[PDB]
Amino acid sequence: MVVIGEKFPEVEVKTTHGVIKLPDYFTKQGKWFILFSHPADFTPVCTTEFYGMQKRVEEFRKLGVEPIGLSVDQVFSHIKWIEWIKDNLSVEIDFPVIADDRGELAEKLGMIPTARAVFVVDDKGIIRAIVYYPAEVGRDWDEILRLVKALKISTEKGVALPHKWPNNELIGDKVIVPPASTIEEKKQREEAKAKGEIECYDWWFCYKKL
Amino acid sequence: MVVIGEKFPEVEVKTTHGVIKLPDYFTKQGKWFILFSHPADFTPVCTTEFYGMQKRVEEFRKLGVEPIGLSVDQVFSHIKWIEWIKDNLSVEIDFPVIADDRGELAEKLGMIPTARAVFVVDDKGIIRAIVYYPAEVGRDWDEILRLVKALKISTEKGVALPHKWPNNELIGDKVIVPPASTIEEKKQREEAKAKGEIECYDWWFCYKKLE
Amino acid sequence: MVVIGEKFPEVEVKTTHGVIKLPDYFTKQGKWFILFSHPADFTPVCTTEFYGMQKRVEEFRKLGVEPIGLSVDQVFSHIKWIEWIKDNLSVEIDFPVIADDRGELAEKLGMIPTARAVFVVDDKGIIRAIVYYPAEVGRDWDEILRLVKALKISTEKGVALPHKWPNNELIGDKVIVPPASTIEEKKQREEAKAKGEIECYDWWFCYKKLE
Amino acid sequence: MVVIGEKFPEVEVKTTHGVIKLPDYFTKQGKWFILFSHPADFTPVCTTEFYGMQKRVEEFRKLGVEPIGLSVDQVFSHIKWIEWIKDNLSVEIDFPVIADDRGELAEKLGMIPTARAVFVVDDKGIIRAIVYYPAEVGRDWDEILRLVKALKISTEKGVALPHKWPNNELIGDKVIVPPASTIEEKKQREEAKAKGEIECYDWWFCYKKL
Amino acid sequence: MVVIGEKFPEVEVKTTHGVIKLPDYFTKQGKWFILFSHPADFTPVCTTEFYGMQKRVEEFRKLGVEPIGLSVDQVFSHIKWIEWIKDNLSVEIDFPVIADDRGELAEKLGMIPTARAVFVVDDKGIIRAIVYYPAEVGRDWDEILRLVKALKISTEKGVALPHKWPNNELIGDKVIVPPASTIEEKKQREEAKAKGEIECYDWWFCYKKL
Amino acid sequence: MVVIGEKFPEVEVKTTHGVIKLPDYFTKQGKWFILFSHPADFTPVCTTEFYGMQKRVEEFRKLGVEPIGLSVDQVFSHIKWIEWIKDNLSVEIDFPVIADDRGELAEKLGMIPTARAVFVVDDKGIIRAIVYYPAEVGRDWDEILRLVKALKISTEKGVALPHKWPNNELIGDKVIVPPASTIEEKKQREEAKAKGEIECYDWWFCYKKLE
Q: Domain Thioredoxin spans what residues (chains A, D, E)?
């Protein structure tokens, strides 16, 4: 069972796009990845999810984030199920899906306590966020997209993101300055606020434009 | 380290509402709870979260789901921080918040690898879903609301919920029939569909109005 | 790793026909079964095998022998693959197929060293014969049919069956008398032969019409 | 007990043709072998089998496959029993038979849990297929011949063989192209089928002339 | 649990003034420190104590003694509580307070058997005196100031200090000569007293002007 | 090594007043005691301490607190040293002093790391406070007096005492109400204050006249 902050394990996997080495194959191109699991091929909640995912894949890719699925079914069933989606829902799946032949990688990643697990892994191979939904309730990939957006910004810009960013109730798409943690940094906030460089509800709750 | 399906541990916690026994306090009244951790009192992402949560708390409660927060700080900072919320954002927080003294409970639950973890726990004390976000990124309580709406329904109606339900791209707010797992069940789907009882894209992908 | 003579293990399996208990499900009705593994759904040698098997299934059943397949894939691909068989080769598969989730049963039986293994299991739950072919080479169900025909007969009539029976080069469809193992039994063969009750090439090689 | 895919053990055996080292004696000449066991000399089912085998030995040999028997009886009884077959059934056995004096090699190969065991071993000493029939039911060496034919072709040509090849119900003596296992190989099949290089019922079920 | 005469452990701590290394940060400047613990932020007995301490901080500092607090609360609550003291009691706290996140350092120092513990640590990192008061009874920092005064003098001057120095009942602010411990030192006292260099009630109870 | 909250050990000690059992001797009469060690008889800081203590002993006793000294020296030096005190400072010491033969009791209590240790032990045999001063620096019995005054009051009235009580900089000799630890308790503080029952700087900082 892996944990947030941990390195993604070194593993070779078999996919509908060929054998790959994770995390290396993504991390060597400076890319993130979102590894999600799903219970089985030719199941109705999973099929709505692949549809949802394919509709968003290019937004993920434009951020440098590559989605990759995983299920305990062989690659032949994977490919026939992708074809049923093309011929019946008019969408061409083009992200890789792992055929985790005996649940090996799923076991190791604690995807079987296989539920609805999501792992966001950055370009250094570090697990940044983890979701475990049960088999009966489909995910919402808009929230996962929001999360990776935020993850990316907080890394690049040294900032934190408010509840429901970029549509926070109180500050919309403004970002949060990490709370002052010493008497000297409190003074710094107060000066920065006096120069209009930041806005604050208090010395510990400051924010600014993206 | 807890996992989905596992039973929430029996633990006494100190809260802004007093000492309570989890999960019993909630489970004895037939209630679910959403236990969520947050790093510290007097921090800005947490404050926006608390505001978000109080806006939705009555929607959670109408479903029989009680939110309960948790932080490693003592109850007097908890209550002073809540007051700050009232005085500056004029919103009155009225869900309990655990003062997790030395991170004892945070340790048992694996929220100190606290980061922003969420545990959805049903009326039988069973953990139904788990989210771990990092410190820098605030959660979206609308997703957690959506998740428990869906959990309540799948339990009560023996159905499954599509991606992004009740606004699925393909079927909107309809619910999904668990897929046929035998030849006989497949015959049954085809008969039901012929009688207008269900809609199907295939024998394994049938759905219907929630009603 | 199972061997000939050993009793089939007690195991619950999920199939395209539901959950069943092996060997009990078959043994309780006085039936034999032929358990055969195949590598994966949606593969071409397996498909030709499935077609072959469905052509012969009623011949197996007339003998009280039930075929049952097994693969490491979940039951929904099983059933979709069967449908593909119906739609493209217009043959309806109606023998159960086990969905062997993580290769648990495949592991216990040594079919993952799955390759193409066959287990012939009698009405007492005893493994009577075992074939292990590799992935690249499809089986010949006519040989397995011949094998169980011969097994049923040797059990029921206390006889042995010659090479390639019922089309043996030397004696065609006659059956073989177990060879004399004592001086007294040898005298008995010679007396029977003198009375036209058996034919012999020697005292240890006697045979007779199946009747 | 040996297993499919495993190396044949290094062993010296005593035969009606002299002492030999297996698998070496065959593998050094680039030959395969079919090692089969039988319960005893001067038994009726075994005698029908030796007859059947001798009738096919030259077909096996023309493929580079050498048959070798094994039983728990000394070589003197082996030789007298071969003579009874010549004088009574008019056939001259000329494949070696091992005199496995105390069931040693049979024990080691799991031929005694001695039943009716068949081992097909290739020119690299690798067990390619294994049959265990009980003492009461004679084998059919036509099926073993069919198997080695197929084994040989699939090695040489990189192909798979259909149920009952070379007389498959649907495609007769045509061979099967290994199923496409990636989105790129599926495309390749579809192109090859469009050029008449192969025939398919689907992108995963392709076949061609031998 | 530490003990009088023992070295203060090597530890990094997080404070309202930043991360520091104890005892080093004080001992490298040749300074002593008084480490005191308190149960919690925004509590009434602790707040009277911070007030008392701030009123005396400059007297401590003039001796080369730096006060440092410690409590099990994060630095954000520490800073807001210091601000409540400024806005409500008109006093600006300016000694560091440690945010001992999980009671780690408190555990190690036996501050949790967190009670009202005081540790006086000298410029060589040696614990010189230790007080454990329960949560319900506030300390008196005048007595701690008296103690460090005495500690400092006895080190510098090689002397001992009487009950309640510098206002002893019998000798006021005079210091005590360490009792003669041999027949030769007794003689020395008697001679020194005869020269008016010291005053004595007996050869073992001698004292002099500061 | 004893700690605050821990129960004083059962021990027989020889004293200038005879053999006694601690803590029982004091606890059976409902009394507290202040056990304090001192390095040696016939030493000058200790002598000033003894004088200090005898001046205050009757103030300790009026509260039901018995002082008791301890040194590693035998009872005959104890009594001769006390006599020296009477003859030269004309003060009669009348509290017991333990002769701690080989430092046995000093060892158990951690007063030999004796230095100048003080243990305040209540009427239930529980150590309520501990001071360890070094050899060179005499104690201030006025602080120990103040400490037990405060301890007695917090026990009896369920209150807390401010810095330097009964002469606190901010509230003098008023006592402090334990701070509200729940939302409901906070409401109760605000109601009490509105009724003039308590004074507050905030909801968590309320105090009142000792009466």
A: 2-153
